[PDB]
mmCIF file of C-alpha atoms and ligand atoms in Angstrom:
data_model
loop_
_atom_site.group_PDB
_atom_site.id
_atom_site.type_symbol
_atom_site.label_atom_id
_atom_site.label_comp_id
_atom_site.label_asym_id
_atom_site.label_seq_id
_atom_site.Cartn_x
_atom_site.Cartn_y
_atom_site.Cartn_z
ATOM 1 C CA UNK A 478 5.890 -4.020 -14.324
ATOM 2 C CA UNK A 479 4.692 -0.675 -16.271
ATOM 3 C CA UNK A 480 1.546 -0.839 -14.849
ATOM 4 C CA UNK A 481 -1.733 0.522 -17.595
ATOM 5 C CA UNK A 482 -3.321 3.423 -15.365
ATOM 6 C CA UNK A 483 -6.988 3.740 -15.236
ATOM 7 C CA UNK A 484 -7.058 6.636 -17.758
ATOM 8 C CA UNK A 485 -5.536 3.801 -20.396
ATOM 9 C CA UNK A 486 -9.032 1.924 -19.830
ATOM 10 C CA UNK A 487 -10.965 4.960 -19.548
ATOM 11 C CA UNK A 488 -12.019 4.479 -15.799
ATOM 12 C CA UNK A 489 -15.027 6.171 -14.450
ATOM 13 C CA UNK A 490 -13.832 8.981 -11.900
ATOM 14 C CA UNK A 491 -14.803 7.988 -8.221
ATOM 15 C CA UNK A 492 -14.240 9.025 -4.643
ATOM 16 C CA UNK A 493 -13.594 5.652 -2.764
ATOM 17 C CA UNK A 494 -12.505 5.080 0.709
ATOM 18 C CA UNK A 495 -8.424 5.000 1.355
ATOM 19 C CA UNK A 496 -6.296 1.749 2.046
ATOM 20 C CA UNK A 497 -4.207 0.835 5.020
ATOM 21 C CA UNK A 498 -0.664 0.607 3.655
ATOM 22 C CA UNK A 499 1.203 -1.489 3.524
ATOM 23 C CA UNK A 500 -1.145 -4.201 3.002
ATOM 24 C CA UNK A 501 -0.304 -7.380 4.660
ATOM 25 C CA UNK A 502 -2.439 -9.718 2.362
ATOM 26 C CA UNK A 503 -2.139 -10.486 -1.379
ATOM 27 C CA UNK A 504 -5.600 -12.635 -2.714
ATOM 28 C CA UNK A 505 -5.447 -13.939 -5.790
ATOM 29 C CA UNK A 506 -8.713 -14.159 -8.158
ATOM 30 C CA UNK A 507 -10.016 -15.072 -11.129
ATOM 31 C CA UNK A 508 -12.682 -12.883 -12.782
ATOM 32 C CA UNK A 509 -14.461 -16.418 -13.780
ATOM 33 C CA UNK A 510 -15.664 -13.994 -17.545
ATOM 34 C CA UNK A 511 -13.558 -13.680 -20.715
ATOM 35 C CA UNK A 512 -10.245 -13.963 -20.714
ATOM 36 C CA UNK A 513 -8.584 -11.174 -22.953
ATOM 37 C CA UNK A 514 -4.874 -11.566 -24.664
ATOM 38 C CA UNK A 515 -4.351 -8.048 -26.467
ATOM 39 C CA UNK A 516 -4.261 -4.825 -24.579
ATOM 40 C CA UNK A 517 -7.398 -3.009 -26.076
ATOM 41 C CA UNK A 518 -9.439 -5.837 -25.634
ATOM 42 C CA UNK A 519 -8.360 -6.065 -21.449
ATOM 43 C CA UNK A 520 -8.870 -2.296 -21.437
ATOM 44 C CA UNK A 521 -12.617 -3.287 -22.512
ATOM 45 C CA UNK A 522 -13.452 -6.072 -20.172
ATOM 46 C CA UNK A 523 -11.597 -3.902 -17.111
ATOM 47 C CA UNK A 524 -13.352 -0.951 -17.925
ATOM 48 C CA UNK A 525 -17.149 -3.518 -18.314
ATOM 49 C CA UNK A 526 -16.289 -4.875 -15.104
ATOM 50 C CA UNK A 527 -15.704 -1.717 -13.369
ATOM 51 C CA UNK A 528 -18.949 -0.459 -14.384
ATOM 52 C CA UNK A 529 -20.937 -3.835 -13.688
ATOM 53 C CA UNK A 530 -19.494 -3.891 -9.947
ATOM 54 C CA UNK A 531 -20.520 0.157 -9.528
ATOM 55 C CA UNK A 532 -24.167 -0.004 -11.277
ATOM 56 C CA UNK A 533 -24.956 -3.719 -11.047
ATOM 57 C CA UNK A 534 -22.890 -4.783 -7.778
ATOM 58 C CA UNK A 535 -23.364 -1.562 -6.153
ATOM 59 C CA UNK A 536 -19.741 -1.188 -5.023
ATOM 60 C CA UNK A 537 -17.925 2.226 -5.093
ATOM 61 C CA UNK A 538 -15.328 1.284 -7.737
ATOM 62 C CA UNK A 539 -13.967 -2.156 -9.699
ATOM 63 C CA UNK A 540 -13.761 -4.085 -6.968
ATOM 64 C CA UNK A 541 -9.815 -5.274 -7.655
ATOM 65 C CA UNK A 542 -6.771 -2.997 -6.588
ATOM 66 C CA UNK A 543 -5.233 -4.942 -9.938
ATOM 67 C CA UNK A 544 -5.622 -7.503 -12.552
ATOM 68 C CA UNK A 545 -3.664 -9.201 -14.889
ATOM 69 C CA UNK A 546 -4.972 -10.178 -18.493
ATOM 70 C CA UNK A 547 -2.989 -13.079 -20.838
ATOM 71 C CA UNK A 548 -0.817 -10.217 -22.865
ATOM 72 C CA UNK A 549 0.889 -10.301 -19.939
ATOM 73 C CA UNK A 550 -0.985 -6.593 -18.772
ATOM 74 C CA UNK A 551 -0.887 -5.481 -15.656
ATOM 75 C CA UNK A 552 -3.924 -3.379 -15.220
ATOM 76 C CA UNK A 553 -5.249 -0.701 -12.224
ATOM 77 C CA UNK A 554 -7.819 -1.344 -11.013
ATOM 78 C CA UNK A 555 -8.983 1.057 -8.275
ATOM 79 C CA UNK A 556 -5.019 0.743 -7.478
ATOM 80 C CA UNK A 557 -2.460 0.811 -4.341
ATOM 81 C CA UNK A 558 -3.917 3.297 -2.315
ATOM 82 C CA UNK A 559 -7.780 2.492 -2.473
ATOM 83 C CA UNK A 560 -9.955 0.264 -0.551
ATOM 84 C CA UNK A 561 -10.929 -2.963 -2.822
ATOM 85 C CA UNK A 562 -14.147 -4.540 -3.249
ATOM 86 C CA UNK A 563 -13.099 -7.869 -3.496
ATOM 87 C CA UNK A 564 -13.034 -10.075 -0.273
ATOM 88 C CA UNK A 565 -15.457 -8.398 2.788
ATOM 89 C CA UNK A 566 -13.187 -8.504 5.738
ATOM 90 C CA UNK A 567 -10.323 -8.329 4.067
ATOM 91 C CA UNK A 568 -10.299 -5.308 1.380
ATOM 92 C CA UNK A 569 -8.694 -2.716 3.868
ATOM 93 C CA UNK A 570 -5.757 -5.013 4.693
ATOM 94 C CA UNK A 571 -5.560 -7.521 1.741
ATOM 95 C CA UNK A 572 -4.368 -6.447 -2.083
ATOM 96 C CA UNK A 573 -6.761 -8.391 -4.757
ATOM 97 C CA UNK A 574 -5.195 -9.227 -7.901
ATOM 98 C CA UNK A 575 -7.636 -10.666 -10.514
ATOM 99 C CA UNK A 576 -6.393 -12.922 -13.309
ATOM 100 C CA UNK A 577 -8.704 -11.914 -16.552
ATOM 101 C CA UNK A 578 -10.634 -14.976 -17.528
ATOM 102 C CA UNK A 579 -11.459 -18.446 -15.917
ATOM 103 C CA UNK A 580 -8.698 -20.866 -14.982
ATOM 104 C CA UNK A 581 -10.295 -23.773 -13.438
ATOM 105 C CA UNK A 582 -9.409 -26.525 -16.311
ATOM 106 C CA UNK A 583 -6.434 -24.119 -17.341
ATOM 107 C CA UNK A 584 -3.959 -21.729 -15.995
ATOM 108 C CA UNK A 585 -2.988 -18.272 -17.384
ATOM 109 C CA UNK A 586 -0.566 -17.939 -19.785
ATOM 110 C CA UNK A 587 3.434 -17.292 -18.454
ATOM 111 C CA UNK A 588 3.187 -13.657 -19.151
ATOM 112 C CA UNK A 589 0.110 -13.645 -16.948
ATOM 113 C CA UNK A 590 1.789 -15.323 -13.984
ATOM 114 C CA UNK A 591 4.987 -13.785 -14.105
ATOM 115 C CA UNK A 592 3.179 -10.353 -14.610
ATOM 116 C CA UNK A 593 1.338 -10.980 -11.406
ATOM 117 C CA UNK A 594 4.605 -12.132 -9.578
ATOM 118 C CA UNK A 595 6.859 -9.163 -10.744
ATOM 119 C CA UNK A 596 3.981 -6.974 -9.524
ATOM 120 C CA UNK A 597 3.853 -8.646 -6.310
ATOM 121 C CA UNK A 598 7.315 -8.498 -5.540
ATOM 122 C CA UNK A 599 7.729 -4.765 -6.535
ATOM 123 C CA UNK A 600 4.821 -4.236 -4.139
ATOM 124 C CA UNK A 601 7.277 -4.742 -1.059
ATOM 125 C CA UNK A 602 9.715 -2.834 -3.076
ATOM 126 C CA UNK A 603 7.973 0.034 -3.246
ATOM 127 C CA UNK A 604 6.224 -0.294 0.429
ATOM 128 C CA UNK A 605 2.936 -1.386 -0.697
ATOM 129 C CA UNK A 606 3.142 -5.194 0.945
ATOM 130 C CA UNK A 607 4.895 -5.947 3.899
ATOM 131 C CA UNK A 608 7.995 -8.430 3.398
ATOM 132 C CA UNK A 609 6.340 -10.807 5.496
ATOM 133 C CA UNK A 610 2.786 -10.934 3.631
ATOM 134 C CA UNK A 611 0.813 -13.798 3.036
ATOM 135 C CA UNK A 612 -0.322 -15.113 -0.089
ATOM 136 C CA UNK A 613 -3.512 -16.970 -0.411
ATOM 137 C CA UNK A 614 -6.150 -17.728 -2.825
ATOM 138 C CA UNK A 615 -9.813 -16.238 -2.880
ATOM 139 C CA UNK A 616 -11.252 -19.315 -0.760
ATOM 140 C CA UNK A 617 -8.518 -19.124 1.353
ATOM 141 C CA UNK A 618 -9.988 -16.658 3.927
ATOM 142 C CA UNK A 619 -11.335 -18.345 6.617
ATOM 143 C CA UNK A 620 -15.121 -17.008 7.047
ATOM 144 C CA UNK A 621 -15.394 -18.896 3.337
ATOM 145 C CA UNK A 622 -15.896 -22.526 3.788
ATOM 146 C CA UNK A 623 -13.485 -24.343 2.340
ATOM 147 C CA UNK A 624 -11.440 -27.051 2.170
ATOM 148 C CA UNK A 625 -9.858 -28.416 5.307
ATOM 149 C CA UNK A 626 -12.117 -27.035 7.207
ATOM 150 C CA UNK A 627 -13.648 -29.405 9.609
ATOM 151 C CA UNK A 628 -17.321 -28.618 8.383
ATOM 152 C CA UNK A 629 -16.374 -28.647 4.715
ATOM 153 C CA UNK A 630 -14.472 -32.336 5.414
ATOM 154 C CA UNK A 631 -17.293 -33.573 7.129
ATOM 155 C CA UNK A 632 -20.099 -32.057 4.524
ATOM 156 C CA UNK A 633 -17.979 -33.704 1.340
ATOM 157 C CA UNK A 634 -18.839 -36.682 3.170
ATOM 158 C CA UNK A 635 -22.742 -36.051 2.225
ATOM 159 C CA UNK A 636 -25.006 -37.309 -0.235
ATOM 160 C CA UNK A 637 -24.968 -35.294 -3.219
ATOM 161 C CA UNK A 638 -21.787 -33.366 -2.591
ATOM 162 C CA UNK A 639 -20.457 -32.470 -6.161
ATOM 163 C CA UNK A 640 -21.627 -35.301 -7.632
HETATM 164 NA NA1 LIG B 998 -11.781 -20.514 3.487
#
């Protein structure tokens, strides 16, 4: 996918640690804001988010290498060949790709998801992602409780748990 380059949003300039490529992981994320579905309105919320993650978060850049808004955008974030921001233990080795918006009751448009696969699958194309990568979702990373875990099965099993 033609990919919208950080000078598109109007990124702030940085000098951020390197990634190890090819990466081997691919995490998927939602940014849990706004969603956005016309270019110059993703351009705003990826350029916001890159500066709330630098002067509120205190991380070197956006924390996402991409993200994908509902006009079916795929946007840089710090990119391919920076270190991400996104998962600790994991943003040297694993490519974050944020979905724009929240998608808990809903899921992103078509053009969102099929923008996010096209860019995955050009990523081992191009030599980005190794062939045999794994996909996985933010909570998917083990040092996050989650479920199947034995401690989150036998905690859901507690008073009070979501509900
Ligand atoms: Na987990």
């Amino acid at each position: 996918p033609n990919i919208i380059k950080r000078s598109a949003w109007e990124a702030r300039e940085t000098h951020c640690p390197k990634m190890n490529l090819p990466a081997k992981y691919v995490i998927i994320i939602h940014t849990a804001g706004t969603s956005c579905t016309v270019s110059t309105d993703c351009q705003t919320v990826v350029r916001n988010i890159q500066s709330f993650h630098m002067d509120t978060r205190n991380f070197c850049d956006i924390g996402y290498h991409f993200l994908v808004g509902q006009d079916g955008g795929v946007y840089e974030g710090v990119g391919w060949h920076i270190q991400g921001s996104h998962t600790y233990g994991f943003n040297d080795i694993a490519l974050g790709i944020a979905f724009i918006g929240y998608f808990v009751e809903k899921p992103p448009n078509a053009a969102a998801l099929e923008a996010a696969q096209d860019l995955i699958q050009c990523a081992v194309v191009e030599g980005y992602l190794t062939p045999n990568y794994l996909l996985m979702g933010h909570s998917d990373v083990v040092n996050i409780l989650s479920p199947g875990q034995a401690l989150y099965n036998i905690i859901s099993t507690w008073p009070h748990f979501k509900h």
